[PDB]
Amino acid sequence: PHMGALHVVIVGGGFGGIAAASQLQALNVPFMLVDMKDSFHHNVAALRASVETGFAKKTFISYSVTFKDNFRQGLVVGIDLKNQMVLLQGGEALPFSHLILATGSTGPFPGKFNEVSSQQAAIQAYEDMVRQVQRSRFIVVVGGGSAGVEMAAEIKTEYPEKEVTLIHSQVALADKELLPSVRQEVKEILLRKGVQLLLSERVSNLEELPLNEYREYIKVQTDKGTEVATNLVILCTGIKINSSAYRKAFESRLASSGALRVNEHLQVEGHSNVYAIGDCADVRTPKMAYLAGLHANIAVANIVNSVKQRPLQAYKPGALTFLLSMGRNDGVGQISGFYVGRLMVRLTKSRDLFVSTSWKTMRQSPP
């Protein structure tokens, strides 16, 4: 029993979780941030950290340095809604007056990294990836969504002498929600960089392929019988909302996508003190780091507003903002529903990939 006192538990230390923890910390509200890793991952820059020697150490930020005893490393395995408890692997339990679920998404390395690991092992995993790319003259990227087009562009921009093939199962590249003008310009930039495109083809022997590892010879096969020989295979084949921590407890509340249904105040439907933020929230908006941060501000604010019997803040989407870096010198996208060009995207995203914003939030300086 908390007897009216606040204790907020945040499950997930991604873009959403560190924003929520930073604000609760500034408000002196008791809270615990739980993450399976020992450091925040600026995963927007994970593909650049896969091609540039020495960059990976700019993409991982120690939780304990920023949050100290308000941070607990661990894997959440269930939520006990009756006794308001966050269940950790190992048996430990965390009581909460309010729960913020910020579990993000999972997917293949290198675009996502969700291993229980130390900070130096995580950085080394990306430095090893750089070494695999450097050893490999021929490289195949599988999947031409927004991650795969960025991956292929990063490789050919850093290493123009390598041979890069992107294999994609659809006719057009990147997200279907994007303006057709954006999707066509993505294709043209890749072709001008020398990336070979194999569109409307599905790689069919994924079980048989060594992944993220240089080999003298790998044969990639497609459902149409195309065969590509390569030294290296990288999967950018998509992500899944990470519902492990909460799927059982909230099964009745889950969208199809695995997200949690929520109102414009981001409380989970059926609950007044549970919030979902970021990728695991059924925003129906695109899953974006910057939206996770905005959701966190809304979530923390209505926890406080709700204790002050005040009216709640509301999340209202606008047109789609979506920026694709195409290596450090190029890119294309849209800012709230209109096309923005290559100079704009290069300056806004491609050069720095928003890395400095996470170090600022965490109040740390990059090594």
Ligand X SMILES: Cc1cc2c(nc3c(=O)[nH]c(=O)nc-3n2C[C@H](O)[C@H](O)[C@H](O)COP(=O)(O)OP(=O)(O)OC[C@H]2O[C@@H](n3cnc4c(N)ncnc43)[C@H](O)[C@@H]2O)c(O)c1C
Annotated binding site: 12-16, 48, 76, 279
DSSP E strand boundaries for 5-133: 8-11, 31-35, 39-41, 60-62, 71-73, 76-80, 85-88, 93-95, 98-101, 105-106
> By CB under 6 A, is residue 258 in contact with ligand X?
no
Binding region for 6-hydroxy-FAD: 12-16, 48, 76, 279
Site string for ligand NDP, 100-119 (x = CB under 6 A): -------x---x--------
Contact 102, 35 (CB under 8 A): no
226 binds, among ligand NDP, ligand X, none (CB under 5 to 8 A by kind): none
Site string for ligand X, 337-356 (x = CB under 6 A): ------------x-------
DSSP string over 139-151: EEEE--SHHHHHH
Closest by Cα among 358, 347, 141 to 232: 141
CA distances from 139 to 45, 159, 166, 188, 217 (A): 20, 11, 9, 20, 11
> By CB under 6 A, is residue 239 in contact with ligand NDP?
yes
Rounded Cα–Cα distance for residues 190 and 265 (Å): 40
**Which DSSP helix (H) or strand (E) runs through 70?**
none
173 binds, among ligand X, ligand NDP, none (CB under 5 to 8 A by kind): none
> By CB under 6 A, is residue 146 in contact with ligand NDP?
yes
- For ligand X, the nearest residue by Cβ is 14
Contact 325, 49 (CB under 8 A): no
What helix, strand, coil percent values describe the chain, rounded to 5? 30, 25, 45
Contact 138, 232 (CB under 8 A): yes
Rounded Cα–Cα distance for residues 29 and 185 (Å): 47
> By CB under 6 A, is residue 44 in contact with ligand X?
yes
Please report how close the Cβ of residue 1 comes to ligand X at its closest, in angstroms.
Answer: 25
CA distances from 128 to 61, 125, 163, 212 (A): 19, 5, 20, 9
What residues contact residue 263 under an 8 Å CB cut-off, 6+ apart? 269
**Choices 6-14, 73-81, 115-123, 236-244 (CB under 6 A): range interacting with ligand NDP:** 236-244
> By CB under 6 A, is residue 286 in contact with ligand NDP?
yes
Residue 59 vs 146, nearer CB to ligand NDP: 146
Residues from 290 through 329 that contact ligand X (CB under 6 A): 290, 292, 323
Residues from 86 through 145 that contact ligand X (CB under 6 A): 102-105, 111, 114
> By CB under 6 A, is residue 206 in contact with ligand NDP?
yes
Residue 162 vs 287, nearer CB to ligand NDP: 287
Rounded Cα–Cα distance for residues 315 and 238 (Å): 27
Residues from 161 through 200 that contact ligand X (CB under 6 A): none
**Choices 32-40, 187-195, 213-221, 359-367 (CB under 6 A): range interacting with ligand X:** 32-40
Please report how close the Cβ of residue 287 comes to ligand X at its closest, in angstroms.
Answer: 5
Please report how close the Cβ of residue 98 comes to ligand X at its closest, in angstroms.
Answer: 17
Q: How many CA atoms lie within 13 A of 263 on its CB side?
A: 12
Site string for ligand NDP, 149-188 (x = CB under 6 A): -x----------------xxxx----x-------------
> By CB under 6 A, is residue 7 in contact with ligand NDP?
no
Local structure of residue 235 (DSSP, 8 states): E
Site residues (vs ligand X, CB under 6 A) = 12-17, 34-37, 43-44, 46-47, 75-76, 102-105, 111, 114, 147, 150, 242, 244-245, 278-279, 287-290, 292, 323, 349
Site residues (vs ligand NDP, CB under 6 A) = 107, 111, 142-143, 145-148, 150, 167-170, 175, 202-203, 206, 236-239, 286-288, 322-324
